Design a protein around this ligand. Sequence first.
Ligand SMILES: CC(C)(COP(=O)(O)OP(=O)(O)OC[C@H]1O[C@@H](n2cnc3c(N)ncnc32)[C@H](O)[C@@H]1OP(=O)(O)O)[C@@H](O)C(=O)NCCC(=O)NCCS
Ligand SMILES: CC(=O)NCCCC[C@H](NC(=O)CNC(=O)Cc1ccccc1)C(=O)O
Length: 159
Amino acid sequence: MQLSHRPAETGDLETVAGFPQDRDELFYCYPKAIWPFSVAQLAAAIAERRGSTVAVHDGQVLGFANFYQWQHGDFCALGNMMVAPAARGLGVARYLIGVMENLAREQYKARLMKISCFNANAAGLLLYTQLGYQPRAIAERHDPDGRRVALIQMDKPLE
Ligand SMILES: CC(C)(COP(=O)(O)OP(=O)(O)OC[C@H]1O[C@@H](n2cnc3c(N)ncnc32)[C@H](O)[C@@H]1OP(=O)(O)O)[C@@H](O)C(=O)NCCC(=O)NCCS
Ligand SMILES: CC(=O)NCCCC[C@H](NC(=O)CNC(=O)Cc1ccccc1)C(=O)O
């Protein structure tokens, strides 16, 4: 793996919008979105958020993330963390989270990164645990079927 990163561009939107494979995946990474995902929904998130970044390997956009929240001198919250299905388990999200942590420190002087994860998303919970995030609270949310789910709020000091 020879990963690089850059800010997201318009031309990346169709590829990134293709990443969520089912309603569950979309809900995990973008719970306010509606299935099917679309480039217009992705572009609306980008416009509302900060720090939209892609990860690239061998000429392919394989990952995307942004900041859900940003508070100068305080914290950022990671959002919209998505990886291309063919490139899952290869370190793309680990790489991009490291990039985003640097960006939070450098641009926002953040002391902390917040990352929330839905309970069903075992891969995510284990990912963030691996990266040094600790659980802090659990909030009730509802999925598109009106069923109760648990949102696990985690954080990590940035140093
Ligand atoms: C969750 C997701 C972003 C992980 O991206 P990824 O690039 O595949 O993850 P990485 O390869 O960087 O793996 C980093 C760590 O995440 C965890 N992880 C990733 N995929 C996993 C899987 N299928 N099962 C268990 N743990 C997993 C592991 O702890 C892994 O560390 P390890 O490989 O050293 O054990 C990706 O599966 C995805 O896009 N899922 C749908 C969108 C989503 O859920 N995003 C929001 C998460 S809050
Ligand atoms: C890093 C990453 O991609 N994590 C996945 C979880 C979602 C991350 C983030 N939301 C939040 O952190 C919190 N926002 C919410 O809970 C919004 C919500 C609204 C209605 C029902 C459920 C949920 C986001 O919208 O990107």
